[PDB]
């Protein structure tokens, strides 16, 4: 089991870390949702699917910077919604093919009532998402750590 970003940065068997650099919608009002669909950015596959089945969760999702200070969040994992920053590990998704498949994570972020000006700065860390991979074969329990960066400023008009 291994993963890569859309730009080709890999995290190999056994886990590790990578940075994800994403363009964000440039403006969001109070009462609107800013969505970041990381299923377009992070892909994984099972290396031996006719022998082993891989199980994959969002173990934890943490917010940083302007997301932490100025937004209320949910994360959708495999179509189901949970608080973000997270308060539990999600259910699992099965990876059963050598063909890369998206990691089905999207952030839904809405400004807090006192948010204003530039709320997320260009280049800043917005989230750390931990993908946890286990299987039906042995005791493997590996963390794939995705450090999510905003490419651009996001403004919240008042
Ligand atoms: C008959 C023995 C087959 C032994 C192949 C081991 C391959 O392990 C790798 O690939 C497996 C399949 O993706 C993962 O479950 C595991 O964590 C690791 O990434």
Author numbering: 1 to 158
Paper excerpt:
The adhesin FimH at the fimbrial tip specifically binds in a catch-bond mode to terminal α-D-linked mannoses of N-linked glycans of the receptor uroplakin 1a on urinary epithelial cells. FimH is a two-domain protein, composed of an N-terminal, mannoside-binding lectin domain (FimHL) and a C-terminal pilin domain (FimHP). FimHP possesses an incomplete immunoglobulin-like fold that is completed by insertion of an N-terminal donor strand of FimG, the subsequent subunit in pilus assembly. The two-domain architecture of FimH is a prerequisite for catch-bond formation because the interactions between FimHL and FimHP determine the conformational state and ligand-binding properties of FimHL.
To test whether ligand-binding causes domain separation in FimH, we determined the co-crystal structure of the ternary complex of FimHF18·DsG with n-heptyl α-D-mannoside (HM), an established model ligand of FimH20, as well as crystal structures of the isolated FimHLF18 and FimHLK12 lectin domains in complex with HM.
